[model samples]
Target: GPSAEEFQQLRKKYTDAGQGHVFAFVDELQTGERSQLFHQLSSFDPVRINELADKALNPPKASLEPLPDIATASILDSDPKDLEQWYEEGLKLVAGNKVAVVLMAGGQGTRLGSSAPKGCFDIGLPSHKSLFQIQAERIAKLQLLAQRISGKEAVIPWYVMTSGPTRKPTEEFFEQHKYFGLNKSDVIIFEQGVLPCISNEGKILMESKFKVAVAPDGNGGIYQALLTSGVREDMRKRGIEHIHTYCVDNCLVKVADPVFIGFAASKQVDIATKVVRKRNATESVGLILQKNGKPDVVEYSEIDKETAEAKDPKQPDVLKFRAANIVNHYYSFKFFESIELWAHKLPHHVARKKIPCIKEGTGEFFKPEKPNGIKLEQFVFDVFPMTPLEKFACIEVRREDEFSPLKNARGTGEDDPDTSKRDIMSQGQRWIEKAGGIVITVGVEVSPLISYGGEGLEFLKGREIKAPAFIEK
Candidate 1:
């Protein structure tokens, strides 16, 4: 590894190169050397790193906790007409050309057993289109939808977040797909920052002077990075006032859900999120609940059994009515601004992951099965406390229409629990065909709106819907 002075020299070079606006918080290189990776955080902090490593590597008393059920389903029952009006207002905002879309694609396909990022996986589609293509197709359809509804050619700008592990392949994949059919100018791919990995003892584990064993700082880093990276400024320059953010794995997430955007805009709040009704108390996910009579996400792993089983026996399984987080979220530009303005006050959460690191003497890298260090992260939700944002209206979507996520592409393991996900789109398609809608077998394309409610499409009738295909209005 290069000496600390060499690191300093590298920092000077970049600093002198006029990238001064980019702060250390954006990419803190140790003292001064330029690492091969852009975000050069490591697991070598003096104290906290080791504590996290010890907890992750040596877990003995882990237990499941009940999460609160916080669904805004009651609002949906108020009136479909009012909901449509909200969606229509959102569409009008789009027509005025004020919205942008951001996608978090920082993860690798290692969990899915793929050599490439999971987004590159084909999902065994008939058209040989990868996940990336499916997303592009949907975006294209949404663009068309916007034009059809509002009579405006509102081009939605797309910002994709990539990380060290998948950055090169992600860029190359986009090249391969020609920016997934988006105009080259409208697509902006930014790198998500990475931080270091420390051992249980808090020692810095270095693979080389220029390389630190680090991971993406989780999805929460987006808000600040956007502000610091000048991407946020760029959005403002383009008059982009709203941002619809989504994770990459969910195959059925409604991009720029009009109802979600409408509720967010109408409330004049900075952020909005979509949620699903939990299948039962045993479901593992974070739920939005009341903390001190205010909205907060109580993770399932944090609540105890007394609360879990303490359901109102009067209502069957209604005890823990937690609004399970669907990871479907929206953030207004104002919300994004507040996050950066008060980021220092927001608390971060930690997670354990199987990481790859370099071992000494043998000169070979050892990727331990157990967690090596604490991965501190900021979530999009971290910005919640920054504003008077009370409740992020949790719009309810049919699980079959928007719940199909690509979790377990590797195998039938617990973490890869996606049997329901694998069947949702296809099952929805069968219902469409049975309802007299023409099911089109696109050449490897995936579209969520096509499965929801096209003119001719409807739900399953008598028999079980089994086939996977595309449908239309």
Candidate 2:
């Protein structure tokens, strides 16, 4: 409960800021409801919300450069000598249990017609495995790979970031499935913080008469979640060096990929990000660029057509600035520790979203059809500048192999469930072809449990595959 003077001061500030409506109906509520609303209002910062609104409306205009960066997959193809070295080093780290994975899985699947976390959605694979299961399987496979190479036992720990709405369900889901056959202790979950959703009119929206609508602060909250949840302490105690972090929406996520891990470790960089080439000149994606020798990002809307289509002189087929963000990254434990020193410098982005609110004067709760408010949040990439040139690393991955994101409804066309499943089938087809097999059916599927990458398909060599053709052990 707040002091009597505290309520007077808080109400005065919100009233003066044109947000007195938050308490407009509070007085009409019973003690149970009124008491809860008071507690929420107690944590509400009138001055900070206004400051965020002001900044969102008027952002600083800082001119920066789009420097040529990131070698494509061709670099790995060209270096069997150095490639093996990096690969071996990466596997050794994983084999020694010195690597952890952080999955940004706080997203709800409302857009995908599911109320559960996106990680729980099954992308219609032949195996019908959820995104979380697929990722867990990849880590399991990597553990086996590490054991084979180093003759050492290991487990690449899984660290998941869940938001308020998703934390409990995701935990129960993992528990019910027994952490997808991985160690229960190795599967760690932490909840990220949430912030109040403010209306476009610069007032906080009320989810109900008793509660204010809130949204998770965003993926960037991972830094604080790690620090506060003592996940960092667990990381330190485990002596883990590198953590491969990726968003949950990507159905094609390859968890704890030793190649990515080894590449970052081999280069001795503090931070590394995997990116894909832009789909086209005008594709709507963020570009990872270097400004003043440090890592930076430029949005598609900000860049002109000429720059987006600019070609690299040496590699004429490649765009000069084609390294589009996929949100898949590698971070050294020591480098991750510095997040506290620089986290305060990151900016909060305003995400305009449809919010459910209690009607003004009507006292009825209703859902808005269009965006009615902005969710103040932060992104993981906003800390790019903190990494010095020598400490920053970027890798270009083929989109077909690494970047099909699931976001919209199935019929909405791109980045839908259809596309993600297609990517999976296509990838399985490629692996089948690579493994010396021929498939008449185009819609092929492989169980991740049966084959980790291109392995365990020797029996299919010189054989013809047909429909209902699920490659399984």
Candidate 3:
């Protein structure tokens, strides 16, 4: 109670310092009332929660391990023969033109100690290119690649999932930057669903009639929100076959990596995932492999410290302890459609959260720096086991090339946003040098989380790749 009062004072000092008034506007534009239902559900009686715990803990079997390499990993390896085969397989679900790009662009820069959304943070080469710009350019690059390979004019749709906190600023930033070169029509922004906070005794934390203390429901809300917002139906109408999805932080997320697409297609999988090799036992990441014959996100902390030491003796060839989760993934259209329908039938996972709730009788509020209630979230990966035809594919990517995440800026040391921008430029410089181009300070944009490795690469080779530069090679 002492901590609560103290934090209430602190919360007032930081009254949405990171979130601000943008979420208030988004609440006005969208359906904030209907979302409160889930918040109320989170406050279910303890007996009901206890009765449903088993089903929440257990799920059906999911496929495991990586599929065999289709071919060497090369951005230049697209061939007609394989393309034809893949098209035939994908046609059953997603059409070539039906492909859509979805980005999870919601989180605030609080971990980075900033008030803006993480996507607006600059992870640029000397150019001052923001994260949103770099991703926008990458979407352009992917669209170019798609046209070349499929012999189809692909008006690649870009879907950005913003949160209650950053929705307006994120949209305004994108517009100010001109959607980073992609057509404005091609870019669609939607807010991810949020969950309400509840007390230990399972009572609703209310702010107003339509509002409550809520947080984004992880990335899992993507499935439901997409359908509910007409993303799936729009894609279906557009004739897209596959949906490429990834989080905002990493610099080198292959926007619709071809190998990931081909392999998932080859397996006739409805959904697929791409992961990098884990650095060591100490790294904090979710484990996406099959456990108890089902696909589950076993948090590193969940695995016993002893079991972590014991490597998979039976399958030592692929060290189970050596791989990691990247949170980058793809899904076929039909499978995506199925999950939207099934989400309501699925059980919810209760996560403890520090939420600010007003006490009923006193008209006073309790704001805790530490969690006082469970935050229920339905993750996008929850649908992994729904299909027997699903594939769990792990793609090996250089940590420097693909794995600098910006979940928190405090403990990451030099891996912070500022340093990560330098890293992206540094790599771009090296690439320029390799091409016999003079290394001049050129500008590049790397999106979302600033990690040492970002997507923007520049060459001082021909012309200076400046802040406004957009190029494809």
Candidate 4:
């Protein structure tokens, strides 16, 4: 525990930053609470909070467009043979242990009617496996695939980033699951930084007398998390060269995707992204385009219907601005310094929401129905514009085959648990059929561990499988 002098020093610092109210209930706390509160206060940076508040209080950029020389264009569409070549190349790299995966899983599934981390949700698959299990098995299968490719043993380290609030339960879940067959050392979990939630008046809000309301600094927070938590040092010691980073909720994300990584490495880019064509022109997803000659993303909210609905002259079936920001990205180790710089420079926006807080001058807790405070978040994609445009790579894939996210609770709308579950079953059906299998029954699901993308299923060519069959090796 920190000494009284230490507590006073931080208290005075917050006072000077005009956030002294955070310490309002401090004096009433006893020994254990005192230590916890002091510990929490130690991590709070009033200086940074003030900087963020000052910056966020101002009007942000508006009316962005594609650079004058640029127009909305089609994304790079790979041929079947090209995909196989990239897959082989990527597998070789993976076998050499030059690649690692960083999963952005700092979110809790409040929308999915659970307090557990998003990755822990079991999206009702036939195997009844959680998203975390599905992804882990994918990595295990990929390691096997790469092993056969180079005739050498290889492993893909899974670097999972969890927010402070979501970290403990997630760690326990992974521990109980025994890392889902991955070597314990290969699964590295670290937490991202947090920022104080502030009122419109630029002061911090108190979730309780002992804790300040703070949100994970957002996906861009991973850069600092990697550096601060020694994840970068781990990568350096492991001789990792490429990184596959993606959100945890996407049900169909190819974990440590070889083709995507190989394609980016093939192009010698600082960053590579696997995108799905915008689900029709009207679907709301960020458009990745050239801005001021740099590869940047204009958010769905920022673009008008006219801009989003524009057609490509060559491909009438695809929208001109079809490159959706799916958050499936690749990064080279050489690009870290650049990413580190932009991580600090990336501006943040507020997500105003009804946050629970301690009532004024009372020890009681209260939840506000109306918006009460703002959480400042930074988008991980914001750093794309900082990289060289000529070195950027974008490849488009099918949406049904990938990119179904489990977001909301059960619903008819997109990105719900049911939709994600259906997409997984559908994808498995497609891959199984492609591998010369017929669903003699109805929907059949092949567990990711059984066969990543339905490879080596020739024995099933004439077999009649029953409905709701879970094929696992």
TM-scores of all predicted structures: 0.77, 0.89, 0.72, 0.92
Cα RMSD (Å) between model 2 and the true structure? 3.0
Q: Which stretches of model 3 miss by more than 4 angstroms?
A: 1-96, 148-152, 208-211, 312-319, 345-347, 389-392, 438-473
Residue pairs that clash (backbone atoms under 3 angstroms), model 4: none
Write model 3 residue lDDT over 186-218, tens digit each, in one string: 798999887655556555465543345667776
Query: lDDT (CA) for every model shown?
Result: 0.62, 0.82, 0.60, 0.81
Candidate with maximal lDDT: 2
lDDT rank order: 2, 4, 1, 3
TM-score of 1: 0.77
Off by over 4 Å in 4: 60-76, 280-284, 301-320, 337-339
Worst 10 residues of 1 by lDDT: 62-71
Candidate 4 residue-wise lDDT, 241-296, digit = tens: 99999999999888888887887888788888767767777666788877666788
- Per-residue error (Å), model 1, residue 390: 4.5
lDDT at 243 for candidate 1?
A: 87
Q: Report the error of model 1 at residue 309, Å.
A: 4.7
Candidate 2 residue 129 C-alpha distance from true site, Å: 1.0
